[PDB]
A paper describes a structure:
RSV polymerase (RSVpol) is a protein complex consisting of the large protein (L) harboring the RdRp, polyribonucleotidyl transferase (PRNTase) or capping, and methyltransferase (MTase) activities, along with four phosphoproteins (P). The RSV RdRp is a nucleotidyl-transferase responsible for de novo RNA synthesis for both transcription and replication of the viral RNA genome. The RdRp domain contains the classic polymerase subdomains, fingers, palm, and thumb.
To gain a comprehensive understanding of the interaction between 22 and RSVpol, we conducted a detailed structural analysis of RSV L+P complexed with compound 22 using cryo-EM. This led to a 3D reconstruction with a global resolution of 2.72 Å. Subsequent analysis allowed us to model the RSV RdRp and capping domains, as well as four partial P proteins. This binding site featured a deep hydrophobic pocket located in close proximity to motif E (comprising residues Met866-Asn876), which formed a β hairpin connecting the palm domain to the thumb domain of the polymerase. The subsequent pyridine ring engaged in face-to-face π–π stacking with Tyr423. Hydrophobic interactions involved T-shaped Pi–Pi stacking of the indoline ring with Tyr861, as well as halogen bonding between the sidechain carbonyl oxygen atom of Asn812, a component of the conserved catalytic motif (Gly810-Asp811-Asn812 [GDN]), and the bromo atom. When superimposing the compound 22-bound RSVpol onto Apo RSVpol, a notable difference was observed in the RdRp domain of the RSV L protein: the supporting helix and supporting loop, which are missing in the Apo structure due to their flexibility, became clearly defined.
Residue numbers in the entry:
A (entry chain E): 131 to 157, 174 to 199
B (entry chain A): 11 to 133, 184 to 618, 627 to 677, 690 to 1460
C (entry chain B): 131 to 228
D (entry chain C): 130 to 186
E (entry chain D): 130 to 184
Write the structure that this text describes.
């Protein structure tokens, strides 16, 4: 109740930092991790049906 | 190899062609100062060189260089031609006598049908009406003789040229005497016109001459129709059309439009196009109230004056440095053109007469002045600014657009599948939305907030629909042209217009492409593909082989038509097909319904839509696409991609086109290529060539933008707090807006409606500008109380048509291939039915049809381009045979009879008599026999109120005896009844072009390099043999069940392609790269035409009626039993069930006074006025919808199957329903289910709908049975009458009792309604009641038969195996697992 | 603990306020017409003054300024106005018609 | 009161998520397809994974 | 309960940071970054085939 809200606050601070960095810059591994994770979770849905045969 | 040229304009008039020809001939910039004139004078084409080297052209050029003649522009000579009145000779008598003869013959032909109708209703000329009309039409007026003479002259010139060019290739017509004053040098590649006493000369093209002839024909048709209608309305006010034009004003209108076209220039069409708005203003001044109509009037004036100022500016700019610099009139510089314009507009108002009928019919004026020359590079440059512009959006706008789209999709899934779509992102939803998700519900628009859409825009989906794995050959194959690859684009231009390095490059680089890549048409693009595979499109889409492809171009041809190579066109077609198949079910506002009654349906359902203020907004979405970008289209294309499990299939356009060069590939408009440059993406950007196109090509991706517009309308309705009812039909958006308001003190309903309209318009403008679409005051208007949609006008529930606009091009050889006689007759008849279906005039339509049928048969057969006069000799021998058989007195009477008997028996009447009362019928042979009986009553004096009697006049007995007596000669009974359940057999009916060209098409296809076509065409004949052998032992023949069996096999799809290919000219030269016709095709067509003309000699033999001393007795004769016997005897079959149906026009006797008999249907008039045309009543509009089957649908997941599989399942279910009595039904169904669907019968039976209807003879849904039975009157009028069919079920249950009978009650009601209409037309007073009493001699039982016999399983397997390349996708194990 | 919920709410409000003033410029051709440019995101005033300095090439910049600012230009104000005003040629033609 | 104050942070985070996802989707345009990085920004869908599975087993 | 309402917030925050990482990585002008992305995706595909073929 006391630590969790502070984790939320730190993540919001980092969010504001990256959002400034994005919106003022008019002129990779985390992204690949997320891509791989969700591609694996879609392949799992495919495998469930492939094994249900 | 013969060359047949056009007789009507089918194409565009080219600016660049005329520019190049005139620039080479006169040695200077003719129309513009383009690159076209420079390359034309540098390196002219060989046809231009041929035209310039003639002996008369050299003389005229010498005269021009000496300053003795002045050069002009084609609009000047159009104005000169349309006022040609040097018709003062012994030429003035011949034209008048010819027109008088045509009119007299048309009335004499119409007399027979008028007599028959007046006899049936109980109401050389035998009718008093037509005798008065003939007395009234004895002197044609001068304005009609003018246009008839002009059309005759121009048509003679064209016929002479076409005949002499068929006989000799490379023929130039040099004419000086046909049209006194003018000198024509006509050809296929140009036209030179010279006027000697005015000292004028012009150069134009062949299509411009065709346009001039079409103009003269259109004005002749207008004058004919208005003269006939005026003469009809002078005898009886209900007899003619609803319009009342005066032809002096119409002549003045033609003159002033020609003056506007001659005064400004080619640029003058832009002005006349604006006058449509002017007419709309004159309509609103009648229907709308002060504020709306004042707003529209001021906006219209502004639009017209802006158009005129822009026209003057562009005209003065274009002709500055050309050879036409001294052709600009002085009335343009000093501004005195306005006076002219004013007079024009005044005449239009004087022509309107302050009447909605005149003002609605007056829209023919915009098809009277011709067509402009379309400048191509300029049309390309006009949109380059709109599609290269940068757009700025707020992120909230895109979020809310995506959220509204996702809301529409969620709501559609919940309504259609009782299930939220599968989300992969439900973490992002809040609690109140998670409740909706897990309860499988959604909130309404009144409970929806703008934050909810931003929350919804974050959802991601799983695959819900599946892509087909094998290509459908019916959707990718058509009869159009295709774009070359990017390296072979320079083959779009003549070799003379290309530099030497480009020619060398083309010849050295055509050696590295396939034979299908070097193709210039779609059909041969597919036929020449020797590496074709049906899983090519699926692999292209899944692998994204269309992204970053170096073979991609966009080629424009003007109104612009764009094309690309074949792969990208495949991807485009597939994307639009998937949208039409899977998504348009969630957007019921998107329509594609263009039709006679469908538009009336839409306008009716639109009219059905402390105060409730209302308004309507009309918007034009033609230029809607140029404003779209990736950011605005693909936020929804992404949702569709996720729903189909693919990537960038619906986003292909804005990801591929920005990297392509857009080029104009007109033949006469090449670009300037700098030397040492061969690649197209390296050529300098110029007029007619550019890059970096953002925005989308017109026509491609239209459905995406339609559903996005609908989502934006939902967003606007949310933001504005009012109710919206929207309709989009193509490129026309209509919005009805409603809002509850509390009226102030003294405020009127009108002011509240106006305030609502203004605020809604502000909100619409702002919400459209938020996504980068800037609406103009020329594309949008507001109103309150007039229903307008797709150029169709309704007011107070009454519909106002524009028939004259659609009957403008009726003529000799319209809409045919190789000048077919039968198709031309059919098209004339079908085009003239519109003066009766919409115009509500039987007799005007009839007389116009007879005028042009007589002209086409008795005057234009002698002048056939390929069949010089053989068809006329055939006609004369048929007339002699008819005169001998029926004991007539002349060949004139013989032709009057020939023109009145149906085309089924070999006659020349394209319109059967039942179509004046109802539109559909279930049996053509009975209608043909009844029509023949009614027509022959004219000569035999039989009365159509008594019964069939034997009299001393035995013409009808002779006719019926020759109909039922002939020599049986059947051949291929079952496959023929499969492809047409109404066929006769034993050569008892006329043949059509498909049956004639089938074998030629298959032998041409047997040699195609594509194996999918070669094997099919090589197995065609044995497949036909097997298909005839399949269902031959099932003895009770049901041709509709045979049709159902036929449609469930791959030979159906194989035959679609052949029927499509057999509709081209020169079928033999498909793979020969030639535009000429082979003599074999001409011989085939000629012999077909001759056989079809002389059919009436074989059907009605003089041979003692085929040695039949027995004559037919008519005492107690049933026409429907005779029809059934005739149909069975021609196929040598014992019993054929479910095809014969009585005729309502023959079965029903018509009474007007009520009697104690108390029988038949009753039709009463609920209106209180004596007349009904142009009124509305308190009843519901009659739509004769038929009763389909009652069936229960099994419960499974349907979106797991495609559409072909869901269609095959319904077909197999109908087969299980119908042929459930045969002796080996289990093996039959097992074979079908395992051959076509891939599953066994036990597993497939779980997806079959179960039919609760017992009598399939009565309720079966096949493509060969009519689905609805409307009347021959407009819908708005059906509301004036009330019907009851109860007194007939009391007599039909004592004679049969609880049994099904063969009769359509829908057609009975339609007959009654059209009968009311026609009696009002002919008597000038509508009757109060009519009673229809049936003849029970014609009604029979309809009980489902018990089938006996065995189906041949071996032949079924042979048919399935020989055409295996057209089978649909099998249902997999992975798919059948998810089905449950 | 509300003293921390307040600092969470202020941060959420700041993020939602800086996300409701973002402006997106569509992708298009570069300067001197060679290549395509990416889509650009940036705060409202920065984008407006980038339009003024014509660093982003476009026509009709006045309505762009007046629409990125929640304001109504006079062109669009008469497009949706109560009454329509004629032109000199329009009044000439209207006098000729009456 | 803590739950009623936590049921608003969620509705603000959901709006932030919607806006940021719309931005992610609108930023993967023709230049991303030209450079070949668009599938790293939109995700791999059923058809590619099925092709990978068919070429794996 | 409160622990679930905090778990939801944690999940949403992680999703937001993921979206922001995507947006900021994809917005790199030099060609090096966009070449690294496609090389990493090349790798990922034929490393996913490994885990698929294993089981
Ligand atoms: C400003 N504005 C107009 O003046 C009109 C209305 C009248 N209209 C026609 C044209 N042809 C026919 C025919 N047949 C008919 Cl029946 C009406 C032309 C354009 C119009 C239509 C649409 Br959608 C959108 C805006 C406008």
């Amino acid at each position: 109740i006391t630590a969790r809200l502070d984790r939320i606050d730190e993540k919001l601070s980092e969010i504001l930092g990256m959002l400034h960095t994005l919106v003022v810059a008019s002129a990779r591994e985390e992204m690949i991790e997320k891509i791989r994770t969700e591609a694996l979770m879609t392949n799992d849905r495919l495998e469930a049906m492939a094994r249900l045969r | 190899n013969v060359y047949l040229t056009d007789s009507y304009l089918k194409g565009v008039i080219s600016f660049s062609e005329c520019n190049a020809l005139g620039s080479y001939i006169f040695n200077g910039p003719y129309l513009k100062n383009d690159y076209t004139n420079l390359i034309s004078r540098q390196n002219p084409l060989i046809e231009h060189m041929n035209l310039k080297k003639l002996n008369i052209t050299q003389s005229l050029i010498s005269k021009y260089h000496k300053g003795e003649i002045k050069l002009e522009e084609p609009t000047y000579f159009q104005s000169l031609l349309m006022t040609y009145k040097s018709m003062t000779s012994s030429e003035q008598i011949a034209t008048t006598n010819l027109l008088k003869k045509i009119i007299r013959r048309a009335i004499e032909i119409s007399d027979v049908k008028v007599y028959a109708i007046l006899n049936k209703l109980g109401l050389t000329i035998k009718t008093t009406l037509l005798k008065k009309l003939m007395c009234s039409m004895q002197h044609p007026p001068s304005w009609l003789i003018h246009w008839f003479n002009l059309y005759t002259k121009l048509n003679n010139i064209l016929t002479q040229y076409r005949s002499n060019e068929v006989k000799n290739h490379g023929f130039t017509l040099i004419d000086n005497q046909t049209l006194s004053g003018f000198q024509f040098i006509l050809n296929q590649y140009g036209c030179i016109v010279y006027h000697k006493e005015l000292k004028r000369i012009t150069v134009t093209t062949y299509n411009q001459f065709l346009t001039w002839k079409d103009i003269s024909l259109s004005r002749l048709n207008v004058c004919l129709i208005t003269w006939i209608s005026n003469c009809l309305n002078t005898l009886n006010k209900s007899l003619g059309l609803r319009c009342g034009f005066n032809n002096v004003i119409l002549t003045q209108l033609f003159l002033y439009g020609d003056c506007i076209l001659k005064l400004f220039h080619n640029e003058g069409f832009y002005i006349i196009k604006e006058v449509e708005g002017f007419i709309m203003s004159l309509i609103l001044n009648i229907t709308e109230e002060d504020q709306f109509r004042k707003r529209f009037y001021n906006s219209m004036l502004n639009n017209i004056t802006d158009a005129a100022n822009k026209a003057q500016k562009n005209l003065l700019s274009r002709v500055c440095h050309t050879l036409l610099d001294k052709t600009v009139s002085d009335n343009i510089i000093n501004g005195r053109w306005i006076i002219l314009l004013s007079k024009f507009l005044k005449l239009i108002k004087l022509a309107g007469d302050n009447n909605l009928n005149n003002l609605s019919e007056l829209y023919f004026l915009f098809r009277i002045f011709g067509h402009p020359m379309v400048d191509e590079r300029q049309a390309m440059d006009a949109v380059k600014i709109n599609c290269n512009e940068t757009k700025f959006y707020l992120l909230s706008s895109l979020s809310m657009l995506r959220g509204a789209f996702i809301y529409r999709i969620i709501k559609g899934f919940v309504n259609n599948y009782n299930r939220w779509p599968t989300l992969r992102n439900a973490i992002v939803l809040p609690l109140r939305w998670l409740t909706y998700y897990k309860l499988n519900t959604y909130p309404s628009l009144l409970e929806l907030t703008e934050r909810d859409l931003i929350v919804l825009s974050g959802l991601r989906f799983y695959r819900e629909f599946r892509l087909p794995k094998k290509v459908d050959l019916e959707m990718i194959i058509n009869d159009k042209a295709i774009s070359p690859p990017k390296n072979l684009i320079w083959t779009s231009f003549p070799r003379n217009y290309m530099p030497s390095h480009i020619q060398n490059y083309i010849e050295h680089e055509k050696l590295k492409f396939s034979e299908s890549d070097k193709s210039r048409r779609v059909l041969e693009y597919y036929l020449r593909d020797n590496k074709f595979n049906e899983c090519d499109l699926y692999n292209c889409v899944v692998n994204q082989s269309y992204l970053n492809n170096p073979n991609h171009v966009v080629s424009l041809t003007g109104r612009m038509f764009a094309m690309q190579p074949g792969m990208f066109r495949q991807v485009q077609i597939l994307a639009e097909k998937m949208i039409a198949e899977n998504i348009l079910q969630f957007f019921p506002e998107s329509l594609t319904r263009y039709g006679d009654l469908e538009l009336q349906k839409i306008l009716e359902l639109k009219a059905g839509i402390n105060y409730i203020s209302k308004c309507s907004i009309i918007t034009d979405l033609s230029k809607f696409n140029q404003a779209f970008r990736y950011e605005t289209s693909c936020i929804c294309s992404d949702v569709l991609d996720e729903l189909h499990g693919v990537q960038s299939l619906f986003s292909w356009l804005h990801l591929t086109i920005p990297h392509v060069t857009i080029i104009c590939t007109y033949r006469h408009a090449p670009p300037y290529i700098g030397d040492h440059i061969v690649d197209l993406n390296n050529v300098d950007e110029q007029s007619g060539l550019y890059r970096y196109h953002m925005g989308g090509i017109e026509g491609w991706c239209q459905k995406l933008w339609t559903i996005e517009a609908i989502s934006l309308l939902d967003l606007i309705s949310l933001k504005g707090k009012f109710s919206i009812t929207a309709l989009i039909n193509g490129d026309n958006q209509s919005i009805d807006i409603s809002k509850p308001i509390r009226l102030m003190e003294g405020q009127t309903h009108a002011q509240a409606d106006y305030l609502l309209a203004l605020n809604s318009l502000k909100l619409l403008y702002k919400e459209y500008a938020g996504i980068g679409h800037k609406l103009k005051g020329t594309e949008t208007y507001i109103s309150r109380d007039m229903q307008f949609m797709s150029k169709t006008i309704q007011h107070n529930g009454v519909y106002y048509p524009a028939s004259i606009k659609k009957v403008l091009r009726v003529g000799p050889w319209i809409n045919t291939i190789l000048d077919d006689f039968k198709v031309s007759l059919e098209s004339i008849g079908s085009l003239t039915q519109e003066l009766e279906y919409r115009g509500e005039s039987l007799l005007c339509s009839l007389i116009f049809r007879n005028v042009w049928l007589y002209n086409q048969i008795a005057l234009q057969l002698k002048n056939h381009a390929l069949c010089n006069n053989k068809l006329y000799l055939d006609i004369l021998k048929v007339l002699k045979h008819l005169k001998t058989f029926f004991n007539l007195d002349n060949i004139d009477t013989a032709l009057t009879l020939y023109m009145n008997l149906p085309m089924l028996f070999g006659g020349g009447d394209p319109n059967l008599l039942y179509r004046s009362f109802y539109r559909r019928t279930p049996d053509f042979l009975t209608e043909a026999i009844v029509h023949s009986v009614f027509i022959l009553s004219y000569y035999t004096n039989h009365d159509l109120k008594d019964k069939l009697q034997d009299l001393s006049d035995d013409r009808l007995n002779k006719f019926l005896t020759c109909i039922i007596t002939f020599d049986k000669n059947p051949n291929a009974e079952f496959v023929t009844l499969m492809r047409d359940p109404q066929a006769l057999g034993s050569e008892r009916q006329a043949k059509i072009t498909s049956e004639i060209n089938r074998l030629a098409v298959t032998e041409v296809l047997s040699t195609a390099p594509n194996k999918i076509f070669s094997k099919s065409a090589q197995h065609y004949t044995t497949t036909e043999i097997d298909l005839n052998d399949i269902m031959q032992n099932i003895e009770p023949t049901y041709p509709h069940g045979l049709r159902v069996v036929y449609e469930s096999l791959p030979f159906y799809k194989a035959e679609k392609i052949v029927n499509l290919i057999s509709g081209t000219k020169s079928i033999t030269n498909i793979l020969e790269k030639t535009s000429a016709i082979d003599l074999t095709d001409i011989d085939r067509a000629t012999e077909m035409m001759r056989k079809n003309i002389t059919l009436l000699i074989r059907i009605l033999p003089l041979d003692c009626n085929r040695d039949k001393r027995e004559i037919l007795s008519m005492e107690n004769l049933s026409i429907t039993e005779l029809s059934k016997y005739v149909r069975e005897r021609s196929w040598s079959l014992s019993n054929i069930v479910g095809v014969t149906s009585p005729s309502i026009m023959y079965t029903m006797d018509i009474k007007y006074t009520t009697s104690t008999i108390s029988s038949g249907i009753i039709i009463e008039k609920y209106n209180v006025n004596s007349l009904t045309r142009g009124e509305r009543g308190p009843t519901k509009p009659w739509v004769g919808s038929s009763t389909q089957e009652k069936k229960t649908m099994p419960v499974y997941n349907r979106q797991v199957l495609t559409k072909k599989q869901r269609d095959q399942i319904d077909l197999l279910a109908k087969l299980d329903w119908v042929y459930a009595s045969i002796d080996n039904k289990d093996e039959f169904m097992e074979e079908l289910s395992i051959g076509t669907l891939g599953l066994t019968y036990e597993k497939a039976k779980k997806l079959f709908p179960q039919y609760l209807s017992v009598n399939y003879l009565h309720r079966l849904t096949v493509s060969s049975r009519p689905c609805e039975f409307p009347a021959s009157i407009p819908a708005y009028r059906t509301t004036n009458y009330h019907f009851d069919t109860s007194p007939i079920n009391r007599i039909l249950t004592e004679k049969y009792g609880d049994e099904d009978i063969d009769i359509v009650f829908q057609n009975c009601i339609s007959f009654g309604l059209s009968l009311m209409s026609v009696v009002e037309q002919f008597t000038n007073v509508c009757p109060n009641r009519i009673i229809l009493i049936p003849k029970l001699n014609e009604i029979h039982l309809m009980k489902p038969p018990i089938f006996t016999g065995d189906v041949d399983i071996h032949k079924l397997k042979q048919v399935i195996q020989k055409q295996h390349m057209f089978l649909p996708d099998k249902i997999s194990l992975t798919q059948y697992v998810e089905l449950f």
